[PDB]
Design a binder for this molecule. Structure first.
Ligand SMILES: CCCCCCCCCCCCCCCCCC(=O)OC[C@H](COP(=O)([O-])OCC(O)COP(=O)([O-])OC[C@@H](COC(=O)CCCCCCCCCCCCCCCCC)OC(=O)CCCCCCCCCCCCCCCCC)OC(=O)CCCCCCCCCCCCCCCCC
Ligand SMILES: CCCCCCCCCCCCCCCCCC(=O)OC[C@H](COP(=O)([O-])OCC(O)COP(=O)([O-])OC[C@@H](COC(=O)CCCCCCCCCCCCCCCCC)OC(=O)CCCCCCCCCCCCCCCCC)OC(=O)CCCCCCCCCCCCCCCCC
Ligand SMILES: CCCCCCCCCCCCCCCCCC(=O)OC[C@H](COP(=O)([O-])OC[C@H](O)COP(=O)([O-])OC[C@H](COC(=O)CCCCCCCCCCCCCCCCC)OC(=O)CCCCCCCCCCCCCCCCC)OC(=O)CCCCCCCCCCCCCCCCC
Ligand SMILES: CCCCCCCCCCCCCCCCCC(=O)OC[C@H](COP(=O)([O-])OCC[N+](C)(C)C)OC(=O)CCCCCCCCCCCCCCCCC
Ligand SMILES: CCCCCCCCCCCCCCCCCC(=O)OC[C@H](COP(=O)([O-])OCC[N+](C)(C)C)OC(=O)CCCCCCCCCCCCCCCCC
Ligand SMILES: CCCCCCCCCCCCCCCCCC(=O)OC[C@H](COP(=O)(O)OCCN)OC(=O)CCCCCCCCCCCCCCCCC
Ligand SMILES: CCCCCCCCCCCCCCCCCC(=O)OC[C@H](COP(=O)(O)OCCN)OC(=O)CCCCCCCCCCCCCCCCC
Ligand SMILES: CCCCCCCCCCCCCCCCCC(=O)OC[C@H](COP(=O)(O)OCCN)OC(=O)CCCCCCCCCCCCCCCCC
Ligand SMILES: C=C(C)[C@H]1Cc2c(ccc3c2O[C@H]2COc4cc(OC)c(OC)cc4[C@@H]2C3=O)O1
Lengths: 110, 80, 171, 105, 167, 98, 347, 120
């Protein structure tokens, strides 16, 4: 409840400052500008490597999501099984990284 | 066995430290004597209520009071 | 179905332990030491009957024995206990570890004037046995009669009479 | 086909998350643990055909524990009659249901 | 009005989906799905699923919709849209008017019209969130689940590197 | 039953009808699919938290992880379409009518 | 594709089907379908051409929509039953959604509109995998939920699949689309007898998998994807025209071939249950697919064809293609009817 | 149908009680037909690879016939077992429910009146 008050206050202060920033110099009548970039009008070429690093982020972020309950999982009574599955998950993250390595997926953004 | 190891320690010391720390993390809980006490402390931590037993007449190993000398103890944890 | 039976408001009147949670937490180890038997008779009745309406009187004994626990503090060691639960009461997590000298004064005065030994690490979490006179509930779930199981297979396995009997296949 | 490898090899792959009445961490009961236990112990071994007709009362008690449709229906009826008598003026709330009595424990 | 806050968020959640299933563009479709993920996350957080709410924020919004907006940026440079939007909004507000004037509704299932604060439990859980310990049980009780999920993610890495190669 | 469940299912059916018959960008179809996944996450979470069924608390994370991996797979297909036509317009996917 | 990676991916396809077959928890059913889809997507993109990318995208969208409907069905089952056992469902809405979702995974009508396209866009071995191995897991889930399956829905889907698979293959010259409409028709034949006797459903599944495996293996052995290239087979290998003859006669249901075995038994299990009109018009529609099979082998397999001169080069080389299990599968897809009471091993 | 029967001991191709049933002889006509399917498989295998059909790979045709007879023997054992289980369940169900299968009184044709339809 106080959390929603805080979030709403931060959004309100940000919207206040952004509106004042967009509209305090719009009181000025400075001049009207016509103003008739590295690329001129060429279409943005698709970069395959940027997409590959975004999907590699997404899959390793999912493996992170599996890793996230480990401080609570260390409190279990089945510690041998828990330690085995934790080492197996971090090892599978390392194997996904090794396959991403050796198949040249981490190249030109290495 | 030491030429390849010195070669990878001269070329890729990041990966040598990585595989060495990973190998220690895998094999060392099977060699540590304190790994038993982790299990022992995580089962000694009373998250729930110790639900009492109806005294049937013959349970000598169950105490009648918390301060009775029989039952599980935590002197191994108070000493360590 | 039926009408759920509830006890009257006179059946629920008992003198409440009207003290704060830091007061309860300060004396909690000596409470679990000295008020063992009625508390465990109540919690045995409470896990066995699975019904709080059948656990009122034992609960009253809890509220009878807790108050006599605090009166026996108030007659003897009111000031070290007050100095102790005030220090417990300051902390937002109510740490025992921030309050060890006030604990030592309270434990000293309690062991001197009442002879009570504080429980050690691992004692109040023991599973203890409880000798009551109330009978064991023969059906605590009020379960009705279970359906009879299907008849099992018996008899020695004979061959199929003239095979598959599938249209003309004689085996 | 249901090739029951888990029972043939005697391994517990996914029987543990299957029902609410199973062994939970730290002995946490579900809200309808008793109802689901009663319905499972009714319907065990008798087959689904006999279970749909011979364990109807346990299953209705368990489904009504899960969804609480009858309980919310009764609360709707009581709150609606109470709102009608407040609008008519034939009823007044007591001090323990208006918040003026400094609760018990 | 504060008692129905989960319900109020749910209405916005429905509105949010009609915000983007009308589909003016994958840009604004992504924006509507991000706002929808935030308000449905607020729904989850208001029942005590704090870890699952932070999994909505960290993994769904912070992990995956980032990749959708990224691919929308790099790969993808009215009447039907606004009509489907206002159609779904009129349907949802007529549903809200029905369920608030009746406190009972049937579209497919029978639904109560009081707030869902009634259907909770009156107990406590001691020194733990039950949802936290149930997610901690993934490593102790969920062995086969961890095995199949890790193998699916490893295969997912391999499969992405296969089909993105083009050779 | 619960009233928030009706809204979550109605959200699911809205995104299901948004997936089915529009013939638009492929990314908009993937957005409708992940809105379906979002509503499944919310609905599974509210049920499992409602019933206090502790072992299924790890269930929606599973429902997240697999499906997000699924989402990654879909984007790669889109990118291959985005490497073939220059657009993700699904009416370019009509080579296999004949 | 690296052969090690190909082995790993095919084992993951098999592993997903096994997880659907053996698991008792609905989440693991859903996980097995997710694993199966995620693993089969590179098998379709083996040759890396835009038709395979279109086919894989359409397959992804259909199986993903089906998987979301499956999880919604599981979730409504959790509402109305509070549990997760893979058994009968406890709500007719979950029953309808799971029947719809499994019909989308099989490719049954009215969700058939991807099966002729996707099978056309992918190679013959991946189309073999799609039309044989990808039928095993949803038929297993339909096998386990049949106490909850609505009869009118499953029979509507079944006869709609049989009619659309019958009247869709009359127009077809592509062999992969003929196999795909044959797939849709046979899944209608499997699911119409499901609530009457599921052993005959399994019998139809196994006989269909044998005949489909025979047909795709002959297609890979001859490298023919069209009717007209199939007509050029007698001048290269005359026995292959004989084998596609007898196997296409078997898939339509001629006696005394083995593909007459299931559907006859299916009619035999539908008149016991006093349904006379339904297997009658069902086999009336099967006569139409048998009839275009008889045009597609009379007009364009038996009577010998104009060839090309470059074929006389191909006379000097034998087939080095690994025709794995092809004589065994050809014998089993034709000559198995005298062993018709073998079906009891599937009980 | 019988899936609740082989669910108490699942994944058994031949159970223990299947050993109380007479196994098929090696001169079973079903098993001889399966061996003929093996011989046909060997001939089709020599036909598709342009070998002499009746001549090449006599060891290979011998392994085709051997392998089909070997698989078909156990398939016929399971077949006979499942029809034996079907009849066992049938008879034990009729014995455990006498009310559902009444011994209907056998009337001879001296009491049975059938309508005569003349062909004229
Ligand atoms: C139970 C189900 C069994 C199903 C079949 C299992 C095997 C086939 C699947 C795997 C596979 O492809 O293996 C290769 C496969 C050959 O398939 P192929 O390439 O299509 O054959 C063409 C030529 O034969 C290729 O010839 P080649 O030049 O390469 O060399 C000749 C080859 C060389 O052979 C060897 O090298 C074998 C000896 C070494 C084996 C490995 C030892 C380690 O011999 C053969 O291939 C002879 C034919 C083998 C039998 C094939 C059919 C098997 C029976 C199928 C079930 C029938 C059921 C009927 C039911 C009717 C009623 C419903 O099998 C073998 O090589 C060995 C088969 C052994 C059968 C054992 C049966 C008992 C099982 C218990
Ligand atoms: C046996 C039946 C299956 C045989 C399949 C292979 C036949 C074959 O290769 O024949 C050629 C071969 C002689 O040829 P060759 O000199 O070695 O070389 C062939 C040339 O290269 C061929 O010259 P080419 O290829 O350069 O040019 C001629 C061209 C000429 O091609 C054409 O003109 C095109 C085709 C014309 C139209 C179609 C005609 C009919 C063919 C299909 C059958 C339809 C009716 C079946 C019933 C209705 C179902 C549709 O192609 C051929 O003739 C190809 C050769 C194969 C022809 C025969 C194929 C029969 C397969 C279909 C029947 C069996 C499966 C379905 C059965 C269904 C249910 C009964 O003949 C045999 O091997 C016949 C068998 C003779 C010995 C019998 C011994 C019996 C022993 C019994 C005891 C052993 C078992 C003990 C069991 C118990 C143990 C415990
Ligand atoms: C002391 C210990 C040791 C003692 C040793 C004693 C024995 C020493 C000799 C060893 C050899 C034994 C041979 C097997 C036993 C006798 C089998 C027999 O005659 O069954 C009669 C069987 C029924 O007669 P039965 O009077 O009721 O039984 C007399 C016996 O007690 C028969 O026994 P059952 O009453 O128990 O019969 C059981 C039942 C009797 O059957 C039934 O209850 C009715 C169901 C039969 C199946 C109907 C399917 C119809 C639709 C498919 C038609 C396919 C196209 C036709 C064939 C085209 C070419 C493949 O069988 C079945 O249902 C199984 C299916 C039929 C298998 C027959 C054996 C085949 C082996 C050779 C295969 C070669 C092709 C044969 C013809 C294939 C078509 C059947 O006859 C038929 O079904 C008609 C087919 C002809 C019989 C096969 C004769 C085997 C030898 C053939 C040599 C010539 C081969 C020429 C080259 C290949 C052809 C191009
Ligand atoms: C967050 C903390 C920091 C906030 C920002 C700083 C605080 C002070 C903000 C207000 C300062 C004054 C107005 C903005 C600056 C004006 C500069 C300028 O060019 O003004 C000329 C402009 C225009 O004057 P002009 O008519 O000569 O325009 C020149 C352009 N031609 C000739 C082409 C038309 O003045 C204004 O627009 C007046 C706006 C209001 C001025 C202040 C009123 C009282 C505020 C208390
Ligand atoms: C590669 C495989 C690595 C993990 C193998 C299993 C490790 C383990 O100890 O699991 C114990 C765990 C749990 O057993 P447990 O010994 O902890 O049992 C104690 C009981 N509970 C869990 C309630 C406290 O799993 C099993 O025993 C069965 C499930 C997994 C079996 C292995 C599957 C391997 C599949 C490979 C493909
Ligand atoms: C068993 C223990 C646990 C193992 C699993 C957990 C691992 C944790 C770390 C995860 C790492 C993930 C990614 C690993 C990829 C490994 C392969 C690799 O990198 O090979 C390529 C590399 C040559 O580099 P290049 O290809 O040119 O790359 C650009 C940089 N120049 O070639 C190399 O770098 C050579 C790499 C092999 C030699 C490393 C030897 C290290 C030895 C340390 C002491 C012993 C440790 C015990 C375990 C044995 C490890 C071999
Ligand atoms: C109750 C159910 C329980 C389970 C029951 C069992 C179900 C069995 C279902 C079988 C499905 C088989 C699918 C195909 C095989 C899988 C692997 C595969 O695709 O192998 C083909 C392989 C591909 O090699 P590649 O190099 O890619 O080929 C391209 C050509 N240059 O190589 C080739 O292309 C070579 C050409 C020949 C391939 C023939 C493969 C035949 C496989 C099917 C055998 C018959 C089915 C088994 C028996 C009946 C079981 C129901
Ligand atoms: C070729 C045959 C190879 C057989 C290998 C072993 C198979 C096996 O033992 O399977 C066990 C299964 C019986 O197990 P059960 O759980 O009763 O099956 C229910 C099926 N809906 O038994 C069976 O499924 C037997 C029938 C298998 C037929 C496979 C080829 C057609
Ligand atoms: C073109 C296709 C798809 C089919 C139809 C067809 C053939 C080949 C041959 C013939 C045929 O039409 C039939 C029509 O009626 C009978 C009826 C017969 O018996 C009932 C009979 O017996 C041999 C023969 C015939 C025709 C016949 O020779 O291929």
């Amino acid at each position: 409840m106080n959390l929603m008050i805080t979030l709403l206050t931060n959004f309100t202060l940000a919207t206040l400052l952004v509106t004042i920033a967009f509209w305090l110099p719009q009181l000025n009548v400075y001049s009207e500008k016509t103003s008739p970039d590295p690329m001129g009008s060429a279409r943005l070429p698709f970069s395959m490597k940027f997409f590959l690093v975004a999907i590699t982020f997404l899959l390793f972020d999912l493996e992170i999501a599996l890793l996230l309950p480990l401080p609570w999982a260390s409190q279990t009574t089945n510690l041998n099984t828990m330690l085995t599955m934790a080492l197996l998950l971090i090892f599978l993250l390392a194997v996904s990284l090794a396959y991403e390595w050796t198949q040249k997926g981490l190249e030109w953004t290495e | 066995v030491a030429a390849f190891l010195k070669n990878v320690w001269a070329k890729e010391p990041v990966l040598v430290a990585s595989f060495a720390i990973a190998g220690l993390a895998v094999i060392l809980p099977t060699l540590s004597p304190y790994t038993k006490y982790s299990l022992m402390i995580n089962r000694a931590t009373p998250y729930n209520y110790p639900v009492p037993l109806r005294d049937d007449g013959n349970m000598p190993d169950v105490p009648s009071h918390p301060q009775d000398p029989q039952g599980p103890s935590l002197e191994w944890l108070k000493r360590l | 179905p039926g009408i759920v039976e509830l006890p009257s408001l006179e059946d629920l009147k008992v003198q409440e332990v009207k003290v704060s949670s830091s007061v309860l937490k300060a004396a909690a180890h000596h409470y679990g030491a000295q008020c063992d038997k009625p508390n465990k008779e109540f919690m045995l009745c409470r896990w066995e009957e699975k019904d709080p309406r059948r656990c009122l009187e034992e609960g009253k004994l809890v509220n009878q024995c807790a108050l006599e626990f605090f009166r026996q503090i108030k007659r003897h060691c009111a000031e070290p206990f007050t100095e102790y639960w005030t220090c417990i009461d300051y902390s937002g997590l109510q740490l025992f570890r921030r309050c060890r000298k006030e604990q030592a004064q309270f434990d000293k005065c309690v062991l001197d004037k009442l002879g009570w030994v504080r429980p050690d690490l691992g004692e109040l979490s023991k599973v203890t046995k409880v000798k009551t006179d109330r009978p064991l509930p023969e059906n605590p779930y009020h379960s009705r009669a279970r359906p009879e199981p299907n008849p099992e297979v018996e008899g020695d396995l004979k061959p199929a009479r003239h095979g598959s009997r599938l249209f003309f296949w004689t085996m | 086909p249901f090739f029951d490898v888990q029972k043939k090899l005697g391994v517990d792959l996914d029987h543990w998350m299957t029902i609410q009445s199973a062994e939970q961490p730290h002995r946490i009961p579900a809200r309808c643990h008793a109802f689901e236990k009663e319905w499972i112990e009714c319907a065990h071994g008798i087959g689904s055909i006999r279970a749909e007709k011979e364990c109807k009362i346990e299953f209705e008690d368990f489904r009504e524990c899960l969804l609480r449709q009858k309980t919310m229906k009764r609360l709707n009826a009581i709150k609606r009659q109470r709102d009608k008598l407040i609008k008519e003026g034939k009823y007044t709330p007591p001090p323990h249901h208006s918040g003026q009595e400094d609760l018990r424990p | 009005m504060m008692t129905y806050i989960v319900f109020i968020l749910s209405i916005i959640f429905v509105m949010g989906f009609v915000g983007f299933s009308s589909k003016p563009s994958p840009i604004y479709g992504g924006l509507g799905l991000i706002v929808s993920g935030g308000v449905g996350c607020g729904i989850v957080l208001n029942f005590g699923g704090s870890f699952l709410g932070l999994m909505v924020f960290l993994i769904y919004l912070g992990g995956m919709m980032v990749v959708f907006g990224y691919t929308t940026a790099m790969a993808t440079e009215n009447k039907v849209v606004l009509g489907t939007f206002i159609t779904g909004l009129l349907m949802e507000f007529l549903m809200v008017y029905y369920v608030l004037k009746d406190k009972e509704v049937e579209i497919v299932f029978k639904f109560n019209g009081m707030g869902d604060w009634v259907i909770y439990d009156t107990g406590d859980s001691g020194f733990f969130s039950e949802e936290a310990m149930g997610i901690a049980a993934l490593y102790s009780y969920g062995t086969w689940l961890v095995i199949v999920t890790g193998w699916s993610l490893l295969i997912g890495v391999v499969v992405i590197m296969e089909i993105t190669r083009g050779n | 039953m619960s009233l928030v469940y009706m809204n979550i299912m109605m959200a699911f059916t809205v995104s299901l009808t948004g997936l089915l018959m529009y013939r638009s960008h492929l990314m908009s179809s993937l957005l409708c699919l992940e809105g379906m996944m979002l509503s499944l996450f919310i609905l599974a979470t509210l049920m499992i938290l409602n019933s206090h069924f502790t072992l299924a608390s790890m269930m929606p994370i599973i429902l997240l992880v697999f499906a997000a991996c699924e989402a990654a797979l879909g984007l790669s297909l889109l990118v291959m379409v985005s490497n073939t036509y220059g657009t993700d317009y699904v009416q370019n996917l009509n080579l296999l009518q004949c | 594709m690296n052969p090690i990676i190909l082995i790993i991916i095919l084992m993951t396809v098999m592993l997903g089907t096994i997880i659907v077959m053996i698991s008792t928890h609905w989440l693991l059913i859903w996980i097995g379908f997710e694993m199966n889809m995620l693993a089969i997507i590179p098998i379709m993109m083996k040759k890396h051409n835009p038709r395979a990318t279109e086919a894989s995208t359409k397959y992804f969208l259909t199986q993903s929509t089906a998987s979301m409907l499956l999880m919604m069905a599981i979730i409504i089952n959790l509402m109305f039953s509070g549990q997760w056992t893979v058994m009968k469902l406890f709500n007719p809405m979950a029953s309808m959604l799971m029947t719809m979702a499994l019909a989308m995974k099989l490719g049954m009508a009215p969700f058939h509109f991807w099966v002729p396209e996707v099978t056309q866009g992918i190679p013959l071995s991946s189309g073999l995998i799609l039309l044989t191995w990808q039928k095993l897991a949803p038929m297993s889930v339909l096998y386990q939920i049949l106490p909850s399956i609505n009869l009118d829905l499953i029979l509507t889907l079944s006869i709609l699949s049989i009619t659309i698979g019958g009247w869709g293959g009359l127009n077809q010259t592509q062999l992969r689309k003929i196999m795909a409409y044959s797939s849709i028709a046979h899944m209608g034949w499997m699911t119409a007898v499901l609530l009457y006797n599921p052993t005959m459903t399994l019998l139809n599944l196994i006989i269909y998998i044998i005949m489909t495996s025979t047909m795709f293996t002959l297609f890979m052995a001859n490298s023919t994807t069209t009717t007209l290239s199939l007509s050029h087979t007698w001048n290269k290998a005359p026995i292959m025209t004989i084998l596609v003859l007898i196997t296409l006669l078997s898939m339509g249901g001629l006696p005394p071939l083995s593909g007459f075995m299931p559907k006859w038994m299916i009619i035999q299990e539908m008149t016991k249950n006093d349904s006379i009109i339904l297997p009658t018009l069902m086999a009336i529609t099967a006569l139409l697919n048998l009839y275009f099979y008889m045009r597609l082998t009379y007009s364009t397999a038996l009577t010998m064809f104009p060839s090309t001169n470059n074929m006389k080069m191909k006379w000097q080389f034998p087939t080095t293609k690994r025709m794995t299990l092809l004589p065994t599968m050809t014998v089993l897809s034709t000559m198995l009817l005298p062993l018709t009471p073998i079906l009891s091993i599937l009980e | 149908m019988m899936t609740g029967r082989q669910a108490r001991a699942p994944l058994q191709f031949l159970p223990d009680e299947a050993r109380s049933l007479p196994p098929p002889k090696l001169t079973d006509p079903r098993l001889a037909y399966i061996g003929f399917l093996g011989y046909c498989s060997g001939l089709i295998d020599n036909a598709i690879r342009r070998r002499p059909v009746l001549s090449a790979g006599l060891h290979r045709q011998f392994l085709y016939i051997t392998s089909f007879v070997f698989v078909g023997y156990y398939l016929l054992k399971r077949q006979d077992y499942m029809y034996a289980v079907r009849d066992h369940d049938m008879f034990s169900y009729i014995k455990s429910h006498p009310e559902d299968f009444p011994e209907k009184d056998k009337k001879t044709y001296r009491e049975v009146f059938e309508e005569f339809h003349p062909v004229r």
